RNA sequence: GGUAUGCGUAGAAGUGUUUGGCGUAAGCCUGCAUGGAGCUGCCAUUGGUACAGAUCUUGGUGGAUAGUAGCAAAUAAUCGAAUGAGAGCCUUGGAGGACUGAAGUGGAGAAGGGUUUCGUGUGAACAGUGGUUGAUCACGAGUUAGUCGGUCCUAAGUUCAAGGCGAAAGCGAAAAUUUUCAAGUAAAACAUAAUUU
RNA sequence: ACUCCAUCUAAAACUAAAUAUAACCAUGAGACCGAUAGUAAACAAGUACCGUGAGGGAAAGUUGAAAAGAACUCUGAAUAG
RNA sequence: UUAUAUACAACCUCAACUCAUAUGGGACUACCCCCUGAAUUUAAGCAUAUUAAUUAGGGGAGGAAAAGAAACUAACAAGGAUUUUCUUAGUAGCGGCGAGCGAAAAGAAAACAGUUCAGCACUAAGUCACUUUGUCUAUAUGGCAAAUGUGAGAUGCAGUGUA
RNA sequence: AACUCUAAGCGGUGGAUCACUCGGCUCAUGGGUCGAUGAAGAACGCAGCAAACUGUGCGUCAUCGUGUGAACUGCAGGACACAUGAACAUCGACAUUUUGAACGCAUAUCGCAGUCCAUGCUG
RNA sequence: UGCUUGGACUACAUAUGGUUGAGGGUUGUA
C-alpha cells in the first residue's frame, strides 16, 4: 500500500552554468552565467550548492513493492490466528480482555444481523468488551510528524476485530465505532490480525 | 468518507474554503437558531442576513442580548452586531467581529425568499426522519 | 528498502577517507570500464576464473529453434 | 439582439446564411462529414445488413 | 529624440503612467501586502532598452 | 542519389561519416513526387501515383488527387473514407501506397524488426525498461 | 582603446520593437526578428531552448478563445439555445 | 576487476533512463479491464459472456503437440459438415474465420 | 506500522543558563529563565540520517579602520544682508575679484535619452563635505503647422512572379528561361495599334 | 544447378477493441519537500534586473483572537524621546 | 473550309475573371506518423564498432496514431489479421569475434471483427453532382419529385462480384 | 581607573532554530475539447478614487440569459426598485479595437490607394 | 464633379461549375 515519491528530474539543472574555472581566486563549481540578476556567479548544479541537485535524486523506479512467498503469508496468518486465542498474547497488546468470558471468544451468528450502531455498542457492552473500545477513545491523539501536515493526524490504538461470515447488516453497523473493524472469513488480511 | 469525489485533504479543504466566493460564503456563515425557533420552524440552522436579530453566546461578550446585526462582512467571515463594540484610542466605537458559528439567531427577518428557505429547510428535516 | 545501519556508511562516517584509502584513493575508474581489457591488463584474471573466453569453436546454426531438441528425460 | 434575431428569420429557408449566422461549433467538426453523410451506405452494405439479423441466443448447458 | 515614430511615442506614453507610486489607500485593504511599487523605473538609473 | 548537402566543408567527425557522394535517400523518387504535389496543393488529398515516362535526368510520374469537399465525393460511400481527418496530408506521414514502401512494413520474419506498429515504435519497445512493481 | 573609449561611440540600434513579439529584437540589416522571425509565417522556437519556449507559449497571454472554448465543451458545444426560468 | 565473478553483460549504455516504464497502474488497469467486461457482458444479452466458440486442438510444434493455440477458426468445412449455415454461424457466434485449411479428418 | 488506558495553554517544540547530577564516550535527564502549540519512551521496519576543512555553497559579521587609505587635474573667491532649527557652497540677491576667451566652460540642432522640461511644495533616502537647494522626492502642468520636417522620388542594396532547386525548412539568386510572363491608349472591324520584358 | 514437396497470392483500399500519454480540460491521492528544502517562482515570478542579440534570471512567507495600529501631555526645528 | 486568303461548327489542349460556392496555410507537444542524423562517451590509446538506427530532430495527424485481415509461421497430431504484456532470452546471431550488441516462431494472456476494389459476362448508363419550381421540415455542405435545366459520364459512371 | 584578559547579567547587531503553510513534487483516475467564422501570441486602452497583478475591448474590472436570494468594503457615493432583484457563481444571447492569419499595397512610414454604397457640404 | 465622415469589398494557391477566349492542335460542313 505504498506509492512513489520522487523529486523532479529537472530540479537542479535548468540553469545554464558553466564552471567559471581557474584562476579567479574563487572555487570551481559551476557558477551561473548572467550578470545583473545577482544570482551571478553564485554556485550551481552541485549538492553542496544552494539550488543545486541533490545527491542521488529519488527516482520512481526504486522498488516500492514486494513479493512475499504465499506459503509464508499463510504461515504468517496461521501464527496470527493461533495467537488471537492464548490470552497472554492478547493481553500483551494492551487490549482490556479481563471481562471477556472465553478465548477465543465466539458469538452466535445472530449478531451479523444487527443494523444500527446503537445496537452495536449495546452488544459490545454486554460482552464486556466495551472497555477496550473505551480505551481506544482514550488514546485518540495527534501525531508528532509531519503527519500533521501530510494528512495523517493520528490513529489511536487498535481494538477488536469482528470476524463475521455474512454481512447481513454488520459491516455498516460497526462502521462508526472508533477502534473496531470487522472482516469476512474468506479474506482474513494478516495486516489486521497482527498490526505492526 | 465513502464517496470517491469527496476530498479529505487539508491542503484542499482550506483553499476551497478560504477562497470560496462571495455567494458560497453565505453557506459557510451559518448560525444556529435558538431552541424556540426549532419549535417554530423545525430548521436547525440558517445563514444570516444583514438584519436578523442575534445573540452572542461564546466569546468575551457571551451575551444575553437583543443584538441586531449591522453587516456580515463576508470577506472577513465575521459579523458585526449592533451593540458589540470597542473603543479606539480616540474613543470612536468600532465593531468587534464575531464568527457566526459562535452567534445565536433569535428572530429572523422574514421576507418572501427567506421564508421559502424555511419551507425548503423545514420539510427535509422531516423527510430525514422518515428513513 | 535495505537496512542501512548494517551498511558500512553509517559507521565509516566519519573517519576521513571512507574506507578506501589515503594512498590509493577511491578514484573514478582506475582499471577500465567493464571487461577492458581481459586480454592485456586483466588477462590473469580472465584465465584463471574463466578459461575459454576469447575464441571461436564452431558450427553456426542461423536461427536455432528450440523444438528440434526438445526430448524430456526420465530414468 | 433585436437586430440579430430579426436577421435570422429573413435568412430562413435560404441556403447561404451569412458566415456569422452559421453555427460556429469548431473548425474541426465544421469540416468533417455531416452526420448524415458519414452513414451513407453502399448497396453492398445495405444488402448484407438486411439478410442476416444478429440473433439473440444463450449457449448454455 | 524629437524625431520619434508613432509607435515609440505610444510606448513611451504607457511607461510614463506605469511609473507611479502605490495609491495611498490600497495599503489599507484587508490582506494587501503591497509595500511599495516594485517596478518603478527611473530615467537615469534604469534605462528601458525593452 | 542524394548528395549530403555539406558545406563544401566536411561532414566533420569520424571517417564513417565522411561520405558525401554515394548516399541514397530512404525515400523513393515516387514518394518524393507525391510530397512536392501534396505540399503544394494543401486542400486536396493524394491517393496514389504511377510512372508515366522517364528520360535520364528526370524520372517523372502522375499523381492522383481528390478534393475532399466536393459533394460528389462526400456523398460517395466508396470514396468517402479519405474525407476523414485522420488522413490529413496522408503521405507526409508516409501512408499512401508508395509511402508504406520505404518504411519497411510487412510480415513476418524478414520484417521482424520492425513489428511494433511502424518502425520507430519497435525500438521504443525493444528498449523498454519494465520496472515491474513486484520484482 | 577597446574599452570605455569605444563604448561611447555606440548610439545606433541594431534591433527595433517586433510586431508579433513587441520586443527589441527586430533586426533591421536582416529585416528578421531574433526571437520569432517576423517575415517567417511560422514561430521561431527550438527544442534546445526549453526555457525560452515556455516564456512565449500557449497560456502565457490571455487566450481570449482557448479559455471560453474550454468552457463551451463542459456544456457540450451548445449554441442558439438560450435558458429558461427554473421550474 | 578482482575476483572470480561471472563476466557481466548489463546493457546499460544507451541512455536507458528515458525508457523506463512504471507499472504503478498495474492495479487500476486490472480494475479498468474488469469493469469493461462487466459493462460488455451486460450490454450483450443473455448471450454468452466471452463468447465465440473457438475450435481447435493440436497446437503446432513438437513441444506443444497438445496444449492449444487458442482456436481462431471453425474453417467452413466444419460448418458445412455440421448442419449450418456458414454465413449463418457468424450470426449466432460461432466465429467462422475462413483462413484455415483443415488438414485432418 | 504497533504500542505507553504516555505528556501538553495548570505552558509543546526551540532557545538561553556559575540548576543539579548521570555516562568511559557519543550523549542524556532535571531546575530556573524565556517561549507560546504541539510532543515523546518502547518494539518493529526504514531514510534526502550526524560536518571543521572541500580557493566548499548561501546569508551574516569581525580586525584592519569604525574610523585608517583617502575625498589634491580643470588658476578663486571674499564682504555684508535676507533666509533658516542649522548656510563656505550650490540658497538667493547686491558689491565683487577672477577664469572660459568666438576652434568658448557661449547659443542651437543629429543620434541617444524619455518627462529629466516648467511652477508649487519638501522628511527620510540620494547629491562619497553640507544642503533651506537640486537632473531627487511629492503634486499640479506643459509640445498647436497647407509653408519646418515626415510623408513623395530613386541610390547602394533588400532581390521579392517559381520558370527553378531542395526530404524539408528554405536559397554566398547584376534572375538573365516564367503563356498576355507587358506599365500601357475615350483605340475601327473579322484575339485598339507600332509598341514594353 | 537438378528432381519433387509444403505454403501463401505481391506490385490496389478501409477497419473498432485491448495499447500510449511530462501537453490540455476535470478530479482523488501520498512512508514526498517544508521557505538556503520543494518548481526558477509558496508573494505584483519568467516578475525586478542584465545582454545589441540569441539568451540569462533573482531575492522576497509569519503583529494579535480582534487593529483594540498607541488618543492625550511634555520637550524638540523635527522623524523622535 | 486550313496560299497562314474569311466564316461556321465540333473536339482537344490552355488561358483569363473583385465570376457563384468551397477547401488550404493552426499554433500546441506528453503520446503518435515520416524524414534527417552527429559527436561527447566506451573500447582503459584509436580509426570500424560503441553511443545510436539516438540529442539537436521538424514535415504531418488523432483522441489515440501507426498497424492490420497473410506473396505469414512451420515441418507438427500442424497453426492462422494487427497491437500489447509475460516467457522464449541476454538466446540463435552479429562483433578490431574485441568492447560489446541482440531478435523472432512456438507457448501464456489482454482484446478479438471483419472486409472493399481494379480486372472475363453483369448484357439497354441501369450513374452521379448542382440548377430553378413545389413539397418535407429545419439553423439539414438535406429528402421527394419536377423541368429530364445545365454539366459530368463511354478515354467509362452504376448494380453484381474479389485473391 | 586607561587598556587588556576571563565569565554572566543587560542592551544591540544578526536571522539560525523550532513550530506553521491556499505552494510544489510524485502517483493515479475520468476525459477529448482544434485556427482564414481569424487562433496562439503581441501592442495599446479601460475603474469615482488604481501603479502592478487579475479582468477586459469604445458595450472596455465587464457581459444577455440563468441559478442563488442581501450585499461590496480602504474610504466615498449610490443600491436596498430583495414583490418583479444586490453582489457572486454560471454562461447558451450579443459583442469582441490595432495586430498576428490585413484578406487592397506596405514600414524603426499610425504611409498610400482602387472599386462600390450611404451621409454631409459641393451645388 | 469638389470635399468630408461612415460602411462594404479587392491576398495568393486550389476544386468543381459559370462566363468570355486562344491556338499552321485535331477534324467537319459551308
UniProtKB/Swiss-Prot annotation, chain A:
Gene Ontology biological process terms in this record: cytoplasmic translation
Gene Ontology cellular-component annotations: cytosolic large ribosomal subunit; cytosolic ribosome
Molecular function GO terms recorded: RNA binding; structural constituent of ribosome
Keyword Ribonucleoprotein: yes
Key words, A-Z: Ribonucleoprotein, Ribosomal protein
Keyword RNA-binding: no
Family: Belongs to the universal ribosomal protein uL4 family.
Protein name in UniProt: Large ribosomal subunit protein uL4
Native organism: Drosophila melanogaster
Gene: RpL4
Swiss-Prot record, chain C:
Ranges in coiled-coil conformation: none
Claim: Secreted is one of the keywords in the record: no
Record GO cellular component, one term: cytosolic ribosome
Family membership noted in the UniProt record: Belongs to the universal ribosomal protein uL15 family.
GO biological process terms, semicolon-separated: cytoplasmic translation
GO terms for MF: structural constituent of ribosome
Name listed for the protein in its UniProt record: Large ribosomal subunit protein uL15
Bias (Basic residues) ranges: 1-31
Keywords: Ribonucleoprotein, Ribosomal protein
Record region (Disordered): 1-37
Swiss-Prot record, chain E:
Gene Ontology biological process terms in this record: cytoplasmic translation
Name of one Pfam family that matches: Ribosomal_L39
MF terms (GO), sorted A to Z: structural constituent of ribosome
Cellular component, GO, one term: cytosolic large ribosomal subunit
Keyword Ribonucleoprotein: yes
Keywords for the protein's UniProt record, in alphabetical order: Ribonucleoprotein, Ribosomal protein
Record-linked InterPro entries: Ribosomal_eL39, Ribosomal_eL39_CS, Ribosomal_eL39_dom_sf
Highest rank taxon of the organism: Eukaryota
Family: Belongs to the eukaryotic ribosomal protein eL39 family.
Protein name from the UniProt record: Large ribosomal subunit protein eL39
Curated annotation (Swiss-Prot), chain H:
Subcellular location: Cytoplasm
Organism domain of life: Eukaryota
Stretches assigned to coiled coil: none
Purpose of the protein: Component of the ribosome, a large ribonucleoprotein complex responsible for the synthesis of proteins in the cell. The small ribosomal subunit (SSU) binds messenger RNAs (mRNAs) and translates the encoded message by selecting cognate aminoacyl-transfer RNA (tRNA) molecules. The large subunit (LSU) contains the ribosomal catalytic site termed the peptidyl transferase center (PTC), which catalyzes the formation of peptide bonds, thereby polymerizing the amino acids delivered by tRNAs into a polypeptide chain.
Self-association state and partner proteins as the record states: Component of the 60S large ribosomal subunit (LSU).
Similarity comment: family membership: Belongs to the eukaryotic ribosomal protein eL13 family.
Entry protein name: Large ribosomal subunit protein eL13
Species per Swiss-Prot/TrEMBL record: Drosophila melanogaster (Fruit fly)
Residue window of the full protein shown: 2 to 106 of 218
Amino acid at each position: 500500500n505504498r506509492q512513489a515519491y520522487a523529486v523532479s528530474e529537472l530540479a537542479g539543472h535548468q540553469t545554464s552554468a558553466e564552471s567559471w574555472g581557474t584562476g579567479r581566486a574563487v572555487a570551481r563549481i559551476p557558477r551561473v552565467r548572467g550578470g545583473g540578476t545577482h544570482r551571478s556567479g553564485q554556485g550551481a548544479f552541485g549538492n553542496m550548492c544552494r539550488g543545486g541537485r541533490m545527491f542521488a535524486p529519488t527516482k520512481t523506479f526504486r522498488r516500492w513493492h514486494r513479493k512475499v512467498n504465499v506459503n509464508q503469508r499463510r504461515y504468517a496468518l496461521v501464527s496470527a490466528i493461533a495467537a488471537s486465542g492464548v490470552p497472554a498474547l492478547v493481553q500483551s497488546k494492551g487490549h482490556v480482555i479481563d471481562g471477556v468470558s472465553e478465548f477465543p471468544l465466539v458469538v452466535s451468528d445472530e449478531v451479523q444481523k444487527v443494523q444500527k450502531t446503537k445496537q452495536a455498542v449495546i452488544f459490545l457492552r454486554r460482552l464486556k468488551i466495551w472497555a477496550d473500545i473505551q480505551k481506544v477513545y482514550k488514546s485518540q491523539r495527534f501525531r508528532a510528524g509531519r503527519g500533521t501536515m501530510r494528512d495523517r493526524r493520528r490513529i489511536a490504538r487498535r481494538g477488536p476485530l469482528v470476524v463475521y461470515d455474512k454481512d447481513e447488516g454488520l459491516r455498516k453497523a460497526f462502521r462508526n465505532i472508533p477502534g473496531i473493524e470487522t472482516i469476512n472469513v474468506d479474506k482474513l488480511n494478516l495486516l489486521k490480525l497482527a498490526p505492526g | 468518507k465513502q464517496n470517491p469525489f469527496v476530498s479529505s485533504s487539508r491542503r484542499k479543504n482550506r483553499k476551497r474554503h478560504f477562497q470560496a466566493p462571495s455567494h458560497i460564503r453565505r453557506r459557510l456563515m451559518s448560525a444556529p437558531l435558538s431552541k424556540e425557533l426549532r419549535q417554530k420552524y423545525n430548521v436547525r440552522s440558517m445563514p444570516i442576513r444583514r438584519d436578523d436579530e442575534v445573540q452572542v453566546i461564546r466569546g468575551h461578550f457571551k451575551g444575553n442580548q437583543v443584538g441586531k446585526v449591522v453587516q456580515a462582512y463576508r470577506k472577513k467571515f465575521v459579523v458585526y452586531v449592533e451593540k458589540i463594540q470597542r473603543e479606539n484610542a480616540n474613543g470612536t466605537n468600532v465593531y468587534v467581529g464575531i464568527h457566526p458559528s459562535k452567534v445565536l439567531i433569535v428572530k429572523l427577518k422574514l421576507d418572501k425568499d427567506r421564508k421559502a428557505i424555511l419551507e425548503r429547510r423545514g420539510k427535509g428535516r422531516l423527510a430525514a426522519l422518515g428513513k | 528498502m535495505s537496512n542501512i545501519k548494517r551498511k558500512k556508511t553509517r559507521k565509516l562516517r566519519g573517519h576521513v577517507s571512507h574506507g578506501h584509502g589515503r594512498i590509493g584513493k577511491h578514484r573514478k575508474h582506475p582499471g577500465g570500464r567493464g571487461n577492458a581489457g581481459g586480454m592485456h591488463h586483466h588477462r590473469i584474471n580472465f584465465d584463471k576464473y574463466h578459461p575459454g573466453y576469447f575464441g571461436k569453436v564452431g558450427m553456426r546454426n542461423f536461427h536455432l529453434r528450440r523444438q528440434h531438441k526438445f526430448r524430456p528425460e526420465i530414468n | 439582439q433585436k437586430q440579430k434575431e430579426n436577421l435570422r428569420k429573413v435568412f430562413k429557408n435560404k441556403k447561404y446564411k451569412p458566415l456569422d449566422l452559421r453555427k460556429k461549433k469548431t473548425r474541426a467538426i465544421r469540416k468533417a462529414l455531416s452526420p448524415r453523410d458519414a452513414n451513407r451506405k453502399t448497396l453492398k452494405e445495405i444488402r448484407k445488413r438486411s439478410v442476416f439479423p444478429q440473433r439473440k441466443f444463450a449457449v448454455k448447458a | 529624440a524629437a524625431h520619434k515614430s508613432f509607435r515609440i511615442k505610444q510606448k513611451l506614453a504607457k511607461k510614463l503612467k506605469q511609473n507611479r507610486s502605490v495609491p495611498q489607500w490600497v495599503r489599507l485593504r484587508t490582506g494587501n501586502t503591497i509595500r511599495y511599487n516594485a517596478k518603478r523605473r527611473h530615467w537615469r538609473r534604469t534605462k528601458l532598452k525593452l | 542519389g542524394r548528395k549530403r548537402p555539406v558545406p563544401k566543408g566536411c561532414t566533420y567527425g569520424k571517417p564513417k561519416s565522411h561520405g558525401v557522394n554515394q548516399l541514397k535517400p530512404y525515400r523513393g523518387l515516387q514518394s518524393i513526387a507525391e510530397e512536392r504535389v501534396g505540399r503544394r496543393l494543401g486542400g486536396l488529398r493524394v491517393l496514389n501515383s504511377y510512372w508515366i515516362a522517364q528520360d535520364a535526368s528526370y524520372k517523372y510520374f502522375e499523381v492522383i488527387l481528390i478534393d475532399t469537399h466536393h459533394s460528389a465525393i462526400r456523398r460517395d460511400p466508396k470514396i468517402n473514407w479519405i474525407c476523414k481527418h485522420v488522413h490529413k496530408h496522408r503521405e507526409l506521414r508516409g501512408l499512401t501506397s508508395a509511402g508504406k514502401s520505404s518504411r519497411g512494413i510487412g510480415k513476418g520474419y524478414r520484417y521482424s524488426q520492425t513489428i511494433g506498429g511502424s518502425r520507430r515504435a519497435a525500438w521504443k519497445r525493444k528498449n523498454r525498461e519494465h520496472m515491474h512493481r513486484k520484482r | 582603446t577597446k574599452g570605455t573609449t569605444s563604448f561611447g561611440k555606440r548610439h545606433n540600434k541594431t534591433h527595433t520593437i517586433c510586431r508579433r513579439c513587441g520586443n527589441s529584437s527586430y533586426h533591421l540589416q536582416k529585416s528578421k526578428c531574433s526571437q520569432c522571425g517576423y517575415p517567417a509565417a511560422k514561430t521561431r522556437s527550438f527544442n534546445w531552448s526549453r526555457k525560452a519556449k515556455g516564456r512565449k507559449a500557449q497560456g502565457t497571454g490571455r487566450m481570449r478563445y482557448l479559455k471560453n472554448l474550454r468552457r463551451r465543451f463542459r456544456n457540450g458545444l451548445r449554441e442558439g439555445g438560450a435558458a429558461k426560468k427554473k421550474t | 576487476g578482482k575476483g572470480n565473478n561471472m563476466i557481466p553483460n548489463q546493457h546499460y549504455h544507451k541512455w536507458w533512463q528515458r525508457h523506463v516504464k512504471t507499472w504503478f497502474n498495474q492495479p487500476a488497469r486490472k480494475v479498468r479491464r474488469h469493469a469493461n467486461r462487466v459493462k460488455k457482458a451486460k450490454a450483450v444479452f443473455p448471450r454468452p459472456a466471452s463468447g465465440a466458440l473457438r475450435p481447435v486442438v493440436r497446437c503446432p510444434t513438437i513441444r506443444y503437440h497438445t496444449k492449444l493455440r487458442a482456436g481462431r477458426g471453425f474453417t467452413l468445412e466444419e460448418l458445412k459438415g455440421a448442419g449450418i449455415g456458414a454465413n449463418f454461424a457468424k450470426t449466432i457466434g460461432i466465429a467462422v474465420d475462413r483462413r484455415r485449411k483443415n488438414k485432418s479428418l
